[PDB]
Design a protein around this ligand. Structure first.
Ligand SMILES: Nc1ncnc2c1ncn2[C@@H]1O[C@H](CSCC[C@H](N)C(=O)O)[C@@H](O)[C@H]1O
Ligand SMILES: Nc1ncnc2c1ncn2[C@@H]1O[C@H](CSCC[C@H](N)C(=O)O)[C@@H](O)[C@H]1O
Lengths: 291, 291
């Protein structure tokens, strides 16, 4: 058994302190070990991001514009959690695909069946005006060209919407499939527990101050670094059993999930952080129907 | 006579401490009072910008890519000044129009007859590689749409070229002809002596650190502010005779020019800043054929 004692898990890309030459045969290995693992991955990252904004006083009163939200099954959980906490938020879920019917019938959540383009962003900006916007993007086109086009749309989302904060889907293209350098918004590169086994995807979290928008250039050399750091994390780290972690499940992803969940606010009061987390996790798995 | 005693002139947009409701009848007033006033305006701003980079140690060894450089008569002066100072610079002047023949026959200056598009920028970036680039843009399409398109090109110039510094032509569109908000690179808004009588144009000066690119949003409310601050500067300020300025010409623009010229480096040693400036100015007027 692959055991280890760990202090804390890697929360951000910048924390990864080692690399491994990516082995292409990894792409054939089992990508998921849990049912609805994708909704779980998304729920944890978004609970983490949104709890932070609450902590900074920027959540209440905002309109969350989630683009690429369908099916969005897990979003029902997110909405319920903050709604029950007394936070006032309007949700605007936009996707050309249809949403899970559990999202219907909520006065605070608007479902839009539209694929967004720059022009549409302008009209909804005019319509949301003057509410404060929090953007969440999870749009999916694959190719490096598909990715670049996605990233380009995400930047137009921020420029037209001009949100107070954003969570963007972010996976650096493969260095060996490089087309050209580009810019992404500056922000924290949040690592994702329960991402597929060999996924190099993270979520870019940003809070906008003043009227400045800071971007950062990404080059092929950066692409090689992302690939190796993420491969090391996936191959080595995520395969660990954290024995000094006294919790029902000691696998790395549960240790990692624990650290994101401990930052979440609950109405119920708990004697220990471990009790709150077990509760949130049980609650989350029950909601998603994960045994 | 319109007299006043002034400490220093307004060097940057941010220094303008007053505003005046723009009077449209100003557009009919004489725009220029000196021959080749346009080449003079350009020469002073660029001597100012380039002298700063020299001061920061980033000029020597760089390739200056000037787009929208034709005719470029004044550029001959700029090139000679730094060349004579011993600074090693390669000039790449690109415009679809032809350059003044005084620019021909210089091994250090390459004249390109091409209107640049994004694709062309990519090929010259590949070709300049790996030299450090200093971008200077003075492209001209008029309409708010023309301007926006120009600004959009200037940002692509910085993103593909990835320069160590830049000087960009910058005039905010009229609030009453607003089309949409946009972003410009962050930098100092250098005011221009000898600009036309009622011009609201300035030059955006930037030095790039790290691999970050910081932009700033410009809105219609910003447009109204630019209009009134610039109108106050043009109508009131630039019409002053600075009597406490002991110089052959006391008009405001000469007082302003003096402060930019005092930052310029010369081989010849002078006993006073006033002697260096009189010398640089005489030299500049003689070169441009201004009486
Ligand atoms: N222009 C666009 N606007 C809106 N949605 C888009 C888009 N292009 C792609 N997408 C959407 O991006 C999605 C990626 S899958 C997203 C899953 C969703 N976030 C969840 O919580 O279940 C697809 O549903 C797709 O239709
Ligand atoms: N895509 C483009 N690439 C290069 N030059 C361009 C351009 N579009 C417009 N311009 C140029 O922008 C110029 C504006 S006038 C510039 C004057 C010049 N800076 C001087 O020192 O004399 C015109 O010469 C025009 O041909």
């Amino acid at each position: 058994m692959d055991v280890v004692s760990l202090d804390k898990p890697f929360m951000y890309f910048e924390e990864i302190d080692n690399e491994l030459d990516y082995e292409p045969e990894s792409a054939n290995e089992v990508a998921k070990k849990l049912p609805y693992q994708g909704q779980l991955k998304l729920l944890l990252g978004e609970l983490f991001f949104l709890s932070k904004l609450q902590r900074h006083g920027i959540l209440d009163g905002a309109t969350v514009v989630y683009i690429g939200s369908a099916p969005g099954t897990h979003i029902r959980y997110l909405r319920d959690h903050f709604y029950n906490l007394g936070v006032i938020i309007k949700w605007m879920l936009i996707d050309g695909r249809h949403h899970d019917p559990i999202l219907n019938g909520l006065r605070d959540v608007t479902l839009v069946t539209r694929f967004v383009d720059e022009e549409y962003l302008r009209s909804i900006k005019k319509q949301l005006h003057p509410s404060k916007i929090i953007l969440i993007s999870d749009v999916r086109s694959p190719s490096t060209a598909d990715l670049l086009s996605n990233y380009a749309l995400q930047n137009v989302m921020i420029s037209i919407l001009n949100p107070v904060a954003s969570s963007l889907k972010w996976r650096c293209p493969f260095p060996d499939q490089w087309i050209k350098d580009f810019y992404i918004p500056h922000g924290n590169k949040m690592l994702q527990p329960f991402a597929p086994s060999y996924s190099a995807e993270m979520r870019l979290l940003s809070i906008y101050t003043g009227e400045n928008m800071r971007l950062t250039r990404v080059t092929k050399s950066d692409a090689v670094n992302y690939e190796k750091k993420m491969y090391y994390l996936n191959k080595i780290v995520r395969n660990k059993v954290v024995v000094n972690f006294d919790y029902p499940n000691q696998e790395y992803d549960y240790f990692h999930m624990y650290f994101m969940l401990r930052t979440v606010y609950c109405n119920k009061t708990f004697p220990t952080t471990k009790a709150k987390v077990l509760f949130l996790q049980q609650s989350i798995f029950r909601f998603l129907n994960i045994p």
